[PDB]
Amino acid sequence: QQWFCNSSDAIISYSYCDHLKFPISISSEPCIRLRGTNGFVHVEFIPRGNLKYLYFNLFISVNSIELPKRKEVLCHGHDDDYSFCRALKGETVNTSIPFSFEGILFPKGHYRCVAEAIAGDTEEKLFCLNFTIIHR
């Protein structure tokens, strides 16, 4: 809907969540191969809050079987690894984030992952993406 790509073992797409539509352009280069991928996550958006304490809530499901909520902190508030942790509310963010992963066996089937970005100082929701990953 909002974006999608084809991997050799994965079909990945996302929309905005039904409850939050704050805009953001995310993509990966190349498309993510669940067997393993080295690439970049390109992000361009204008955040609705400071990113000094940005973290994510990930609600993942495999074939309608839900995993516990996981929290992934990206900016801890002190000497953070990423240049966008400095970004303020209303500031244009344009960055490419390198990533590299490998060697986890994923079960085949239909994954859902709503990714909820939170400004950790105010606990306010920055945006929410509804992901769909079809493995195989």
Binding site: R48, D79, L88, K89, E91, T92, P98
Partner: protein
């Protein structure tokens, strides 16, 4: 159209398609968020009714024009945020009327230079953020002498390529000024010879400035003569990084006096970088997100008084004998390391939390080589095997084991030496209390957090006999079913007692006759169906009680005492104890 957040005080008008500031906003408002509205122009006198306004957010408001009296009436505004507005040209007097301004955020306003920026009369200004603009000069303007309170300037993410002698003239003239400069994400490739002679700075941040090792090495050399309290160096993962990072890149730092050195992420790294001789006279050394694998053989003439290793990648616990080291933080390390004995005779603060650390032989003097330890954090780790009760470490005031796997802590008085301990957290350590003497010696203990554990036979035993000065006791999620006699008769100063989320089947009236100081009693979420008559009668200091989520038997005359008590003391009950649905407080027996 504005979300009322705190009545007549705080209003959230963000993203409401507002063309102008609403006149409906009450005059006593202190905080207004007008961001993400197409304001386009700040008209004169628009905020003149908000005499008590302190914080005003106009981020992403498409503002191109600030009219000549746009801020008339804002005598008390201390924070003004203009991020993302394409103002570009700030005409003279653009900030007239902002007589209490302390924090000006002009990020991404297409600002081209500070010389033309009309802030020379904001004599109250403490912080100036002009990141993400078109500034290409490092010149600190002369009007900074009017801004006697300015302590921080953010120049991050601009187009500064050069730092000249004249650029820092103002600071050379005024050695009394305390100023911090954030230069991160500027394409600096030239620093003039002796530009930093006679220059003093509090905090200097140089992150993500350099693409090439040779350019970074050449520029660091011309920091010579500089005196900084805190120098922050490093790169970002999401920016083009240095090809190689050798220690000799920082050879220039020898001609700089540095009190505190912070190193952040670098693409390339070598363990020798932390042992570089130009860091020998630093008093606070810090590593965050750095690919250091081994920290060993730090020369004893190093004067580090505090060391901080955060989110790093140590394969093996450091070997350290720094005799002047007072504080050591090794936290959130990538991997699992095992503790190795250190010899830090000046050590008084130790934070080893969140390392999945395995500690064999906790704890005594020989592990650490110090008699001055006051703070010890071993939380969020792996196996911590208790084998000694802290001989040599009786100055310890703070002890945290939260979420580590405490082993053998109940097979002796593991804390007998800790007669000055104020704070103990053994919550969620999977400890099964089976020894009444587990807390012998803890006569100074005020805060005891031990939630998420359990007791033998699920009975709360007499473990609090010596902890006469407890003021905070958290026994939640301890699978308790009953309480032994006299467990609380010593805790005359206890102010909080949390026994929620257990399996209590009955209470006894004797356990609460000597909680003279008890203000808060959490008993919700148990299996309670009744209380003895008068159990709450002597809780003369009580202010809050939780009794909900219990299967209360509301038959008369059984529920008589509780219903009448909950009614007379309805201001104290938090939540609603409801009958197995009517609140127990709403039941009148014959």
């Amino acid at each position: 159209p504005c979300i009322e957040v705190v009545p007549n005080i705080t209003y959230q008008c963000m993203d409401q398609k507002l063309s102008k500031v609403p006149d409906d906003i009450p005059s006593s408002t202190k905080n207004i968020d007008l961001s993400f509205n197409p304001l386009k122009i700040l008209k004169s006198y628009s905020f003149s009714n908000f005499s008590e306004l302190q914080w005003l957010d106009l981020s992403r408001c498409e503002i191109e024009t600030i009219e000549d009296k746009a801020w008339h009436g804002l005598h008390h505004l201390s924070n003004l945020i203009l991020t993302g507005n394409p103002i570009q040209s700030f005409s003279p007097g653009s900030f007239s009327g902002l007589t209490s301004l302390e924090n000006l955020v002009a990020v991404e306003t297409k600002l081209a230079s500070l010389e033309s920026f009309p802030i020379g009369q904001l004599i109250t200004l403490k912080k100036l953020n002009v990141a993400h603009n078109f500034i290409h000069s490092c010149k600190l303007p002369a009007y900074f002498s009017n801004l006697t309170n300015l302590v921080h300037v953010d120049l991050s993410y601009n187009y500064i390529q050069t730092i000249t002698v004249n650029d820092l003239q103002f600071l050379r003239e005024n050695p009394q000024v305390n100023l911090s400069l954030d230069m991160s994400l500027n394409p600096i490739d030239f620093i003039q010879d002796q530009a930093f002679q006679g220059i003093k700075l509090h905090e200097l941040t140089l992150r993500g400035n350099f693409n090439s090792s040779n350019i970074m090495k050449t520029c660091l050399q011309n920091l010579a003569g500089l005196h900084v309290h805190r120098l922050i160096l490093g790169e970002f993962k999401d920016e083009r990084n240095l090809e190689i990072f050798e220690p000799s890149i920082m050879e220039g730092l020898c001609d700089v006096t540095i009190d505190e050195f912070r190193l952040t992420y670098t693409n390339d790294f070598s363990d020798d970088i932390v042992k570089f001789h130009c860091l020998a006279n630093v008093s606070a050394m810090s590593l965050a997100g750095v690919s250091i694998k081994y920290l060993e053989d730090v020369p004893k003439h190093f004067k580090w008084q505090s060391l901080s290793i955060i989110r790093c990648q140590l394969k093996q616990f450091p070997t350290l004998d720094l005799p002047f080291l007072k504080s050591l933080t090794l936290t959130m390390n990538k991997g699992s390391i095992s503790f190795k004995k250190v010899a830090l005779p000046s050590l008084s603060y130790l934070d080893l939390s969140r390392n999945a650390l395995s500690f064999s032989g906790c704890c005594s003097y020989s592990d650490l080589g110090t008699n001055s330890l006051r703070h010890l954090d071993l939380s969020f780790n792996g196996a911590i095997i208790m084998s000694a009760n802290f001989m040599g470490l009786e100055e310890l005031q703070h002890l945290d084991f939260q979420h580590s796997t405490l082993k053998r802590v109940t097979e002796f008085s593991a804390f007998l030496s800790l007669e000055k301990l104020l704070y103990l957290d053994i919550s969620y350590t999977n400890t099964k209390i089976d020894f009444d003497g587990i807390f012998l010696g803890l006569t100074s203990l005020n805060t005891l957090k031990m939630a998420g554990n359990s007791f033998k036979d699920n009975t709360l035993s007499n473990v609090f006999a010596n902890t006469t000065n407890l003021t905070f006791l958290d026994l939640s999620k301890c699978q308790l079913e009953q309480i032994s006699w006299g467990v609380f008769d010593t805790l005359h100063r206890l102010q909080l007692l949390n026994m929620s989320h257990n399996n209590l089947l009955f209470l006894d009236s004797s356990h609460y006759n000597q909680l003279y100081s008890l203000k808060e009693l959490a008993l919700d979420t148990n299996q309670l169906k009744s209380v003895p008559d008068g159990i709450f009668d002597r809780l003369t200091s009580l202010q809050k009680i939780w009794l909900h989520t219990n299967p209360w038997d509301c038959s008369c005359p059984r529920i008589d005492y509780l219903s009448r008590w909950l009614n007379k003391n309805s201001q104290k009950e938090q939540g609603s104890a409801k009958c197995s649905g009517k609140p127990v407080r709403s039941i009148i027996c014959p």
